[PDB]
Design a protein around this ligand. Structure first.
Ligand SMILES: O=C(c1cn[nH]c1)N1CCCC1
Length: 119
């Protein structure tokens, strides 16, 4: 019932993501010189270094806020891809499945800790 445990769990999950080869296109903001039309399609850029920095700054209040920003990395890739068979989009789908499989227990444990506190 540790209300704060999600933070270290998210740091460790980000470490696993940074080791995945599939995260390489998403570690840093998209290079707007290589993709000059990026901001014509994407309203809010997001990347894993920004997520990690926001977490380490103490600027997430819950793992649900972190999960919203990670999910934005994946929805941006889906919106930007010129094809559902593109290399970088395919990497995003695998990485999203890995993220979702690992974040589920983090969210469940956090919500359980809040409920126990309210009890
Ligand atoms: O999400 C994409 C992308 C998706 N399909 N093709 C490119 N990018 C983020 C990193 C740079 C490109």
């Amino acid at each position: 019932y540790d209300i704060q445990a999600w933070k270290k769990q998210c740091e460790e999950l980000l470490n696993l993501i940074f080791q995945c080869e599939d995260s390489e296109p998403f570690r840093q903001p998209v290079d707007l010189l290589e993709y000059p039309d990026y901001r014509d399609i994407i309203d809010t850029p997001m990347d894993f270094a920004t997520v990690r920095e926001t977490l380490e700054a103490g600027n997430y209040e819950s793992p649900m806020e972190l999960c919203k920003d990670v999910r934005l990395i994946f929805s941006n890739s889906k919106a930007y891809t010129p094809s559902k068979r593109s290399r970088i989009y395919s990497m995003s789908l695998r990485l999203s499945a890995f993220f979702e499989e690992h974040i589920s227990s983090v969210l469940s444990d956090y919500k359980s800790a809040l409920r126990f506190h309210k009890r």
